[PDB]
């Protein structure tokens, strides 16, 4: 009789609310540097090649993309809350972009 009682798992939302507080308190970059840099180079390749990208330009692009995505997710959370849901769906993303004017 040497068995061990298990601590079970957390409820859905508890670790979510914890990590919400943790990411809203801290300020580090959430997108990995090298895959984002490769993605930026892939997008820039389509117009004209042999285009070198300074580290500061890549960092500014990353900061702008993170700010845009955070604002869009705040608006999409407001959309989901308005529809009596707690889970965001792509339809809220499309509606937020529509009302913001980014999507025609």
């Amino acid at each position: 009789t040497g068995g061990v009682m298990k601590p079970h798992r957390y409820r859905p939302g508890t670790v979510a609310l914890r990590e919400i507080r943790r990411y809203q308190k801290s300020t580090e970059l959430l997108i990995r540097k090298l895959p984002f840099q490769r993605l930026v180079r892939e997008i820039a390749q389509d117009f004209k090649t042999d285009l070198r990208f300074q580290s500061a330009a890549i960092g500014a692009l990353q900061e702008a993309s993170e700010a845009y995505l955070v604002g869009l997710f705040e608006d999409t959370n407001l959309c989901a809350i308005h529809a009596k849901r707690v889970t965001i769906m792509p339809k809220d993303i499309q509606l937020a972009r529509r009302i913001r004017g980014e999507r025609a």
Binding site: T1, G2, G3, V4, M5, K6, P7, H8, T14
Partner: protein, 431 residues
Amino acid sequence: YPADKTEEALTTFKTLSQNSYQNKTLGNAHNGRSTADGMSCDCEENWDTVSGINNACGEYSECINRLTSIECISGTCSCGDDCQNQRFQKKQYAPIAVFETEKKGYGVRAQADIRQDAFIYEYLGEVIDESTFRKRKENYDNQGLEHFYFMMLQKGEFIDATAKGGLGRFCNHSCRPNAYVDKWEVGNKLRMGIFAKREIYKGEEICFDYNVDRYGANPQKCYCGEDNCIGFLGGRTQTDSANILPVPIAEALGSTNAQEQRWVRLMKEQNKSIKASDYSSINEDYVNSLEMRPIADKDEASKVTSALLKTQDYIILRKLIERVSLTKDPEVLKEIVRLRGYQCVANILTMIVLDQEQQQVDVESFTLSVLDMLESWPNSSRNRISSSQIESVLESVKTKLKKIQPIGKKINSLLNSWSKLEISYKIPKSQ
């Protein structure tokens, strides 16, 4: 009610007011990563001037830290000192008593009515590493102790309640428990608390689900008395090759941990698919490939009867009936009669030769393989059959499969033999 055993239970171990640590590194929150920016709730301190009690961070307050299972620390949080979210630190346990149960030993009862979601008692013990846990487990197995006293605080860190701990070690397993264990963060440390899943009245026993990992240990029968009891204490076993079928059912087929190991080791490691641990789907190939040996133990006969009452698979029942055919010990057969094996065999017949999920030739082979031991078992009185009325099922199946004349003639011989038996006299009772 039962006599109080609180002091007697307390004398059996070294009472602790707080968790003890094997070393200062173990038990630290965030795997030892000191969150210097400790999570401070924005609650304003609500001091009731009459009672002088800081009502901030209460049960029905909106304290974020309370929701996220984090305790407020005095001098760091805006809620002030002595808030209502210092339950672990203030040690405000629910009032409980110890009473001797009929079969489970000492058990914990509520001395007062306890609200839903209320903190009952902090599970206490020594925080130990994995190697120390293994050494203590081996020592206790050598000592022959028949009681669990280990809980997993987190990965690689366990809590032992054998020699030192608190009243929580006397809580008994219930398959429909009224309380549950939860993990909380107090400062830079991790605690394990026990909370009320429902409303509990005074005098009622306080129980929680053990969800016990056996780590290869043998099953222990569960005597909780709950209607939803599975009959054994357990939980998801070792990561692979540990179980293909439920124990009682596996041991009914003569299979053990070695035979359940061998099949998976021979195929899964050699690029052939075996699904995860799930007993909802029976793998017929394993049951066919299993070896069969005669039964000479009555507990194995009880496990066979449980397997008959539980398993619906055609192939498992085929191999159990074949094992019974190999079995020829009269005492085990008398035990099966006491367990009313005929009652289970009636349903086993009905599911296969009245309900038709299979082919008539294979069902005929099954019926010929199941009539033989019915013909062979010792019988002395129709009182045995009367507990099952399996003769009715035999008449129904000989009438349905009337074209298969060997089955009909065997059932003729069987009912002729059974009809010669008298009925055991049962004393009439007043009405």
